[PDB]
């Protein structure tokens, strides 16, 4: 005769993968921007 709650904790899981889903998009993004710049010159 009593009753219980529950809680959450965010675990390295996100400490890494979610921060990586910023760093690893913008950085591959940096590679893609470089590609785009080179293609622009090539097309010219």
């Amino acid at each position: 005769g009593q009753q219980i709650f529950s809680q959450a904790l965010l675990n390295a899981n996100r400490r890494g993968e979610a921060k990586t889903a910023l760093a690893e998009v913008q950085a591959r993004h940096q590679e893609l921007l470089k590609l785009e710049k080179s293609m622009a010159e090539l097309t010219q």
Binding site: A21, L22, V25, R28, H29, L32, L33, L35, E36, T43
Partner: protein
């Protein structure tokens, strides 16, 4: 996160577009160089004849 992925999609879209434009120009130039090659062949024949 999503914004960067969208920007990268846009980047690759423009990238493909520019690549295709470049290729169109190259194909016209090669065909056009072939046409001018044929003309120069006619020139070459005429010059040979004039030598004779």
């Amino acid at each position: 996160i999503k914004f960067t992925k969208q920007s990268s999609v846009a980047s690759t879209r423009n990238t493909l577009k520019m690549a295709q434009d470049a290729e169109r120009a190259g194909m016209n130039t090669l065909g056009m160089l072939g046409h001018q090659s044929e003309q120069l062949n006619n020139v070459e024949g005429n010059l040979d004849l004039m030598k004779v």
